[PDB]
Amino acid sequence: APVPPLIKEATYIEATASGYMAEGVLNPTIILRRGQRVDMTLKNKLTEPTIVHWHGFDVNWHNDAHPSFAITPGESYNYSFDVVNRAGTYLYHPHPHGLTAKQFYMGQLGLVIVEDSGSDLGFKYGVNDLPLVISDRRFIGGAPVYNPTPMEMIAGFLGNAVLVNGVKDAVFKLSGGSYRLRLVNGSNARLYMLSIVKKNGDVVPMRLIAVDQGFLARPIEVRALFLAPAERAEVVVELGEGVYLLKNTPIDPMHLEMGALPEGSEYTIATFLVEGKGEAVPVEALSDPPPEPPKPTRTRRFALSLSGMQWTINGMFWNASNPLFEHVSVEGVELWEIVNDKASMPHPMHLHGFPMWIIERKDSPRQVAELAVDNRGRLPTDLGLKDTVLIWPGETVKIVVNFDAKKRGQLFPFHCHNLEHEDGGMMINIAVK
Ligand SMILES: [Cu+2]
Ligand SMILES: [Cu+2]
């Protein structure tokens, strides 16, 4: 059962090429309590600038940290903030402009778990609460390489094998019982459609309980889950004795932007060898429903498009020379109508600083529409509070965001979490007024 090691006291972290080093362990899971104070110093031990981003955290832009605050090698950066996020599974990872994909892919990515009264639901981390950080790699001679061509910067850098928690061909040896699996897409670009199946047997229903920004109102039974880069979905499964497989199953990846392990091919991501009898953990109710969405005062349309060799948002993209460029000025509660062009590819769009309520999916591909659970085209994952949402070519996704006036005068990136798209500039500053 290989999962990241746990630490509570994240006081000092070193950015190294292989990953984050804290208290002698690599990429540990930082576990925090809702409401606690975080004081943490980042030391840059790389040969290039970097900065840590607390993915999904409600903090100011000094603690986000905005990419403009990146530190040079040998420098340090202090983070100090109160955790006001809902209990859930978050990430910490690099955010220097133009260097994030490589640093992230070469190993700098860890989990941040936020806990709250009763949020562990009776499961124990590393026993039956299992994070599965799914990361693909392009292996050459059994070693990962990050060498995207210009066409791979446009499309995303896809690996030829899939790791779980850094482990090739991951195998989990478990006893029969209940398992909470925290599915995390830690890949640069690869999309997954995830299912758990009995080997040579039937699909195991998964009971979705939480996504990016925390618990659903109630568990939802699903047979398959789309999980794009930086999305998180926590499910509960009942495993009897036998062999089970976490698999990717076939999809149309809709690479329509420009005319080794295909995204829609079927393959095993992890194997569960279930022997013995262990604890059953009943999960009948969740005690932390997401808030209802606020009422927006204006509608703002966003078009996702390829402008030549440059991915853009409303035609705009990162100004490498001016990281404080104010691409969009916002205020109050807004409804964002995010339209992905037909000649495009799926984009997992992610907003810093402010979570998002998903209101509606329109013109989704059938493989998505078939999984929706309401009249507004919403997927089960769309029913929780989110911070990263996948928008398919031709599809319109409507979200509502509250640009809290307490954050006036700060800048927060809005960007695609396909890291090649991000390093390629598919990122703009949202300036809160
Ligand atoms: Cu983020
Ligand atoms: Cu993208």
Side-chain angles (χ1 to χ4, degrees):
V3 302
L6 278 187
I7 71 166
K8 179 44 148 64
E9 318 157 13
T11 283
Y12 181 80
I13 294 293
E14 292 186 326
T16 86
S18 312
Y20 294 107
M21 284 299 289
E23 306 185 334
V25 295
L26 195 71
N27 302 312
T29 293
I30 300 169
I31 287 207
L32 306 172
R33 197 83 188 176
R34 182 173 166 73
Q36 82 166 78
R37 162 72 43 82
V38 167
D39 287 294
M40 196 228 84
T41 293
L42 172 68
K43 170 99 155 134
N44 186 352
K45 305 293 264 173
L46 312 171
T47 59
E48 53 189 26
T50 197
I51 194 61
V52 161
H53 172 53
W54 296 86
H55 173 114
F57 268 35
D58 179 0
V59 294
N60 61 44
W61 71 317
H62 291 273
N63 290 282
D64 192 33
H66 191 271
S68 72
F69 298 124
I71 55 173
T72 60
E75 290 184 340
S76 285
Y77 195 88
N78 298 315
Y79 293 85
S80 181
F81 59 86
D82 292 320
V83 172
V84 299
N85 277 77
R86 286 153 58 81
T89 305
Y90 307 84
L91 326 171
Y92 64 107
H93 69 68
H95 226 298
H97 169 66
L99 299 171
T100 289
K102 182 192 81 207
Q103 294 180 12
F104 190 120
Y105 173 104
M106 284 314 187
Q108 287 179 75
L109 164 72
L111 292 188
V112 184
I113 290 183
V114 173
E115 296 191 294
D116 200 11
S117 303
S119 67
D120 64 28
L121 292 170
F123 298 93
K124 175 174 300 205
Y125 180 98
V127 171
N128 48 11
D129 189 346
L130 304 180
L132 306 182
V133 179
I134 308 169
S135 306
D136 68 337
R137 301 285 184 252
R138 181 161 310 169
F139 288 103
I140 292 173
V145 68
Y146 187 73
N147 56 350
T149 65
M151 277 297 335
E152 285 163 334
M153 291 302 303
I154 296 297
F157 191 77
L158 297 180
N160 52 27
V162 180
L163 314 186
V164 179
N165 300 334
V167 172
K168 282 196 109 155
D169 310 295
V171 177
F172 292 78
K173 285 198 187 87
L174 307 176
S175 67
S178 305
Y179 286 86
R180 175 181 186 165
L181 310 175
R182 303 184 188 226
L183 313 169
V184 180
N185 186 336
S187 303
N188 276 37
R190 173 174 300 277
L191 178 64
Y192 306 94
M193 196 175 67
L194 296 178
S195 280
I196 295 207
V197 305
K198 193 71 191 279
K199 196 217 197 200
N200 303 308
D202 310 294
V203 178
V204 180
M206 311 180 280
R207 278 206 305 149
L208 177 69
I209 62 171
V211 294
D212 309 349
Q213 297 277 325
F215 286 111
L216 302 204
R218 69 178 38 78
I220 304 180
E221 185 178 88
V222 304
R223 311 170 75 259
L225 278 168
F226 281 106
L227 200 74
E231 289 198 284
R232 290 87 72 209
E234 304 184 36
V235 298
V236 181
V237 292
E238 303 308 329
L239 305 182
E241 280 188 351
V243 179
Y244 299 79
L245 307 179
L246 177 64
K247 299 197 86 192
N248 193 66
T249 70
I251 61 173
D252 171 8
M254 296 194 76
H255 270 277
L256 294 149
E257 71 276 15
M258 191 70 56
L261 184 66
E263 270 185 309
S265 64
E266 174 127 26
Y267 52 86
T268 295
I269 291 163
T271 305
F272 304 99
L273 304 174
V274 189
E275 168 175 6
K277 177 74 87 39
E279 176 183 6
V281 187
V283 181
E284 311 269 50
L286 308 170
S287 282
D288 191 16
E292 294 290 312
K295 201 169 142 156
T297 58
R298 79 181 58 85
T299 294
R300 194 183 294 272
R301 183 180 192 271
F302 285 85
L304 313 182
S305 316
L306 182 54
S307 307
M309 294 299 272
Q310 174 66 61
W311 284 107
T312 61
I313 302 163
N314 274 348
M316 295 177 287
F317 63 96
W318 197 247
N319 195 326
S321 292
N322 182 1
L324 302 182
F325 195 88
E326 301 191 1
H327 297 92
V328 182
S329 290
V330 304
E331 176 273 332
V333 184
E334 297 194 352
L335 190 144
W336 283 12
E337 199 173 68
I338 303 165
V339 185
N340 196 358
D341 281 352
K342 284 211 196 25
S344 182
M345 55 171 284
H347 298 286
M349 293 306 296
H350 170 57
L351 174 68
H352 292 211
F354 314 87
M356 54 177 74
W357 291 262
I358 315 309
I359 304 302
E360 176 169 9
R361 276 174 191 277
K362 297 171 65 276
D363 304 311
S364 308
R366 168 161 290 268
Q367 68 195 341
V368 170
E370 270 172 16
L371 303 175
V373 293
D374 68 17
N375 83 295
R376 291 152 292 259
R378 288 195 301 171
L379 295 163
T381 48
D382 293 329
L383 300 192
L385 192 61
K386 291 280 283 156
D387 60 56
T388 306
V389 62
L390 189 61
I391 305 124
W392 295 79
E395 181 186 44
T396 296
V397 175
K398 299 183 177 170
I399 69 176
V400 166
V401 179
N402 175 27
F403 292 103
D404 196 301
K406 295 179 278 295
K407 301 225 207 177
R408 185 178 34 166
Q410 304 179 33
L411 307 181
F412 290 92
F414 178 49
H415 69 91
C416 181
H417 217 287
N418 174 320
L419 297 187
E420 282 68 60
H421 295 182
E422 186 186 325
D423 270 350
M426 194 177 180
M427 166 163 77
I428 60 176
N429 277 316
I430 308 303
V432 184
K433 307 300 192 193

